[model samples]
Target: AAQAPEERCRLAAQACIRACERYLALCTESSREQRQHAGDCADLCRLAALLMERRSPWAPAACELAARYALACAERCDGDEPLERECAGACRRFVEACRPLL
Candidate 1:
């Protein structure tokens, strides 16, 4: 369940994607912008993980975006509303892992 920071962040990223997807149905009709934030967080975190896996110098750039989107999603998911809490928790974990790289 635990690994290196990059791998940990990757798993965290995957978790965020899944959480966002699950939260999607409930969030879509309302809080449209929050949906977009979750979407962006999921997408960018995926990219960040890939770049980190590749050990690319540009990985930090992607991680920066990932962190931004994650924060946005987490901010919106602040209600601590079960599913949203899980998604926000995942986003926050990624943010925690990635920020040190920046």
Candidate 2:
């Protein structure tokens, strides 16, 4: 069955924020690139959540961009370390959940 739109968006946004939190936990004292990607991913995810929660028509494109940043962060973290791998997985899940909404 199809999920309700508001609930779906809320769930996806929450997941994305949680993923970002995990990413940040692993990002402290990291290299510049790692820090940059993680921060970008987190910021965008938050922005996406705000837009979605507000029922903004802009959510689609904005969330799409958020997914792109998440994907990029995942790629950068692919083989770096255990936490990075975990963050990558989280990002992938968030992006997957966000796809249908896009």
Candidate 3:
């Protein structure tokens, strides 16, 4: 079912939080570079959620962080790891697509 705009945004935010937690867990078990990427992704997700929660005036700044880190994480994941690549792509797409609303 097609959700309303605000509902979709809220859902996206919640999913981001789950992904951030997953990144944290994976970071603890990953190689150094992977861990770094996961760490960065986690940080970006946190910042994005923070800004989105307030629907703050500085949403662009936070959105940029989300998009950049998502792409960075995707690249760091080597693009060979399907899960990581998809995760990064999804996050980047979500942030990039929605950035204008921020």
How do the residues 11-97 of candidate 1 rate in per-residue lDDT, one tens digit apiece? 777787888887876654438788888888888988988887887878879888989999899988756567878888888887888
Please provide the root mean square deviation of candidate 1 (C-alpha atoms, Å). Answer: 3.0
Task: List the candidate 1 regions with Cα displacement exceeding 4 Å.
Answer: 1-3, 26-29
Whose lDDT is greatest here? 1
What are the per-residue Cα lDDT tens digits for candidate 2 across 1-102? 333654575566667567656667765546678767877988888888888777787887887898899888888865556677777887787788787787
Off by over 4 Å in 3: 1-14, 23-29, 78-86
After TM-score superposition, the amount by which residue 56's alpha carbon in candidate 3 deviates from its true location, in angstroms, is: 1.0
Q: What is the full ranking by lDDT, best candidate first?
A: 1, 2, 3
Off by over 4 Å in 2: 1-6, 27-29
Clash pairs for candidate 2: none
Higher-scoring candidate on TM-score, 1 or 2 = 1
Clashes of 3: 0
lDDT of 3 by residue, 1-102 (tens): 222443454455456546645655653435777666656766676676677666666655766766677667656653455455555655665555555455
